Design a protein around this ligand. Structure first.
Ligand SMILES: CC(C)(COP(=O)([O-])OP(=O)([O-])OC[C@H]1O[C@@H](n2cnc3c(N)ncnc32)[C@H](O)[C@@H]1OP(=O)([O-])[O-])[C@@H](O)C(=O)NCCC(=O)NCCSC(=O)C[C@@](C)(O)CC(=O)[O-]
Ligand SMILES: CC(C)(COP(=O)([O-])OP(=O)([O-])OC[C@H]1O[C@@H](n2cnc3c(N)ncnc32)[C@H](O)[C@@H]1OP(=O)([O-])[O-])[C@@H](O)C(=O)NCCC(=O)NCCSC(=O)C[C@@](C)(O)CC(=O)[O-]
Lengths: 460, 460
């Protein structure tokens, strides 16, 4: 008897207590007004000083989740971290997270860390569902943790960084149930974005190539997903094709907001090119002029790009725009970006609005690994229902974002420079007033002579 | 309908074509004769020049496996790498392995990389079984890959390095079936061995602490495993305790061979301390003098250590010794060490001898993460059976090891120094005669100006 409706029961997001404003950053970088706020679609970018690291981000979000829902230590049977922020080549963040469990005597917890660029959180989610449905499940919850500190050198990528983490409690009878058998996955060997300079926080990135690879992976994953759901539909006696009309919401890994608007447009072009001649003429009149073009052309053909943005605007506004709130206010937090979009979706809509819907999700990691998958939302939206509890837990997201402190581009730059200076340092205590951290935040208190990191927690 | 007897169908091992002799290394290091060959129990240590890296090791073992069993590209639905040899902080070895699959059009392959010290291979194995038993299984095989290049600076740890990789094909109806529900797992936050110097290949290691942590994890995992199997036995109407008598073979992560002899002894001490007063007097006469001591004392008490080695000698010879052949001749290859012991076990015994048996397995990774689990071997040992095929595939292991070239400690040291020199280099082709590689070996042909690695393959 495989457990039913395996999925997300609870979700917690963490982001740092300061950001740099994109309009300010434009002026600081001497670029044209609107290049970041309109061109990239970004409003504010969160960032961390050396006082926070991947361990402290994950400790913070996990302990906050457990405290909020009063989760017993003995109730977690799997705990796994997805990240691409590596501060130790052998020792997993999972082992550090055991600080939260081991003293209580609960150390029989499967899972370690798993990495490929921005895809590791999804890998951990899939692993958790796989475990829970297997002969190895022991009735306990799984906890999926992901997070990252996304930083670039001064230059055109710097405004697309960010930072944060997400923890998700996975269990049976979940209000956001993973739709079984529907993982459209695509992996291939590319060099769009990678981190081969082991002593640098910075990736090597080919911006244009990374955008092309994200979109090609989207094409492939969407095709795989459609094939799989159509096969299920056929078995159930329906020959209809899957299109964006079959998704009520659609969320994406979000390196910047404009990327996602273009990505929803790319999905519509896929629907169009896959549609019958009749359907094309009936539903896609504005796209008929482009019936002979290729998916890849949405990136090079300006008339096509514009037509697609126009044609998909309503769907974007209805299915995707709300999910971008955290991203536009915090930036790209890599593995947890997609899950921050899920949080934003939950924060915007009522349980009654979400009830019974399908949420499509696209996860990408450069290099590359990608999956398109979906959740089915419970029909039960009554007060006190699992769905109501989940939705309610996210409602204060905009207030939380608003409580952060704006930092000048000058000071932000100094803090980034400090990250470079301290990257490899030992025997030191990270500078910074702990009063500038949110209550309950774990932080790096000291790196000792032997490069061992010690953490402390701001009360509350 | 969950698939039956999920487990290992095929196993491939790769190790480099040269080793340094431990007796020679003793003389080179000016250490007492026998310190390495007797003290550590090591005979020869495999090593790689800069011409081989974690990607090339994994490409080699995967392609060799697929060619030997003529595995169709479309037959693999999950592929995941466990390793602690990190040469890119974002881009997974899995993505590079897609070079073997993507041109054939099979890119819908779940899995990425997973890391914690020497435990990642096991994590990948568990993830593969979990996937295969879940709603996400699509009928295809999983492939578990692990490998590592284990190197230390000049000093007392250097003789306990090694290198290699293993690929395992996982599927239903396997001749080595994972015993369901029997994973005794223990994770906790320690600093016994870790790699915080991102630009160095070398770990920070506290040797004594690492030995203590391995043994403590062994205690915890064995206790967890015993509890779980005893619970299954109780449900089946049996109250008897599990002991080493219930294992026909017992294989371990092997940092060096002496460690493993002491580990089997530690398990016997656990049986003894857990046994009834009556059982103690009947079966453990030589241990009664120590009935008041603690598990941890096997490391500090010489009388106890000696008594345990003597008392467990017969069990060691029968259950564990044969499994150490590859380890004594190749060294510690980290994540794939345990699985090399499995290969050694298969190479030594006939299918008829193994048929129907239980193989216990202990996997450890510093930091730490550990699991004690087991396999049930098929009863079918007829010629051409899955078990016969698996066993036969390993029979030439000693011949393969014997075909390697012995390199002087002087030249070995130069090659290690060269690894340090070239670690971060770009825009170069690794020196070394490709004729010194085994046929069919992938190797690093060039690292370009953008730190992109290009691989080539020695024919056959
Ligand atoms: C994204 C790039 C490449 C941009 O770098 P860029 O050099 O600024 O490119 P650009 O000059 O084309 O500018 C971008 C946009 O601003 C517009 N623009 C220009 N001026 C104005 C103005 N005055 N007013 C209004 N708009 C303006 C401009 O025209 C354009 O929009 P478009 O026309 O293409 O629709 C850069 O920031 C970068 O390289 N970022 C890092 C890579 C990345 O984020 N790639 C995304 C896909 S890959 C992925 O998401 C994975 C990732 C990155 O998370 C990593 C991982 O998996 O680990
Ligand atoms: C293992 C150590 C600490 C040893 O380094 P050492 O302590 O300097 O050597 P030693 O002086 O302790 O001698 C060791 C053994 O040789 C004996 N000996 C001495 N001289 C002679 C002689 N003339 N003739 C015969 N025997 C001799 C000696 O007495 C003893 O055996 P014992 O008495 O304890 O049974 C070192 O090599 C090291 O630190 N290695 C790396 C760490 C390691 O392998 N630890 C194992 C457990 S942790 C684990 O396995 C994880 C790992 C390491 O793979 C990492 C990962 O998870 O990623």
């Amino acid at each position: 008897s495989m457990p039913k409706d395996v999925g997300i029961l609870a979700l917690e997001v963490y982001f740092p207590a300061q950001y740099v404003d994109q309009t300010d950053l434009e002026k600081y970088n001497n670029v044209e007004a609107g290049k970041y706020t309109v061109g990239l679609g970004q409003t504010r970018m969160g960032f961390c000083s050396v006082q926070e690291d991947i361990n402290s981000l994950c400790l913070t979000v996990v302990q906050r989740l457990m405290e909020r829902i009063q989760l017993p230590w003995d109730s977690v049977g799997r705990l796994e971290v997805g990240t691409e922020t590596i501060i130790d080549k052998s020792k997993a963040v999972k082992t550090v997270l055991m600080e939260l469990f081991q003293d209580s005597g609960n150390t029989d917890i499967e899972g370690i860390d798993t990495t490929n660029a921005c895809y590791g959180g999804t890998a951990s989610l899939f692993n958790a569902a796989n475990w829970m449905e297997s002969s190895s499940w022991d009735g306990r919850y799984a906890m999926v943790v992901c997070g990252d500190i996304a930083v670039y050198p001064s230059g055109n990528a710097r405004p697309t960084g960010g930072a944060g983490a997400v923890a998700m409690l996975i269990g049976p009878k979940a209000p956001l149930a993973l739709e079984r058998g529907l993982r459209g996955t695509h992996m291939e060997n590319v060099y769009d974005f990678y981190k081969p300079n082991l002593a640098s926080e910075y990736p090597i990135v080919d911006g244009k190539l990374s955008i092309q690879c994200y979109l090609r992976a989207l094409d492939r994953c969407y095709t795989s997903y459609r094939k799989k759901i159509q096969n299920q539909w056929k078995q159930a006696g329906s020959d209809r094709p899957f299109t964006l009309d079959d998704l009520q919401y659609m969320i994406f890994h979000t390196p910047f907001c404009k990327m996602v608007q273009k990505s929803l447009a790319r999905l519509m072009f896929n629907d169009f090119l896959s549609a019958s001649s009749d359907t094309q003429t009936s539903l896609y009149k504005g796209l008929e002029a482009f019936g002979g073009l290729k998916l890849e052309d949405t990136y090079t053909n300006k008339d096509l790009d514009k037509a697609l943005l126009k044609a998909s605007q309503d769907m974007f506004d209805k299915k995707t725009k709300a999910s971008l709130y955290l991203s536009t206010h915090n930036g790209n937090m890599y593995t947890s970006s997609l899950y921050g979009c899920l949080a934003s979706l939950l924060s915007h809509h009522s349980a009654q609005e979400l009830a019974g819907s399908r949420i499509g999700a696209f996860s990408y990691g450069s290099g590359l690994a990608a999956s398109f998958f979906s959740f089915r939302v419970s029909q039960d939206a009554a007060p006190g229902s699992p769905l109501d509890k989940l939705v309610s837990s996210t409602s204060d997201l905009p207030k939380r974002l608003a409580s952060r402190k704006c930092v000048s581009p000058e000071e932000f730059t100094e803090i980034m420079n400090q990250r470079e200076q301290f990257y490899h340092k030992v025997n030191f205590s990270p500078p910074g007033d702990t009063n500038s951290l949110f209550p309950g935040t774990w932080y790096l208190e000291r790196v000792d002579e032997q490069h061992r990191r010690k953490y402390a927690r701001r009360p509350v």
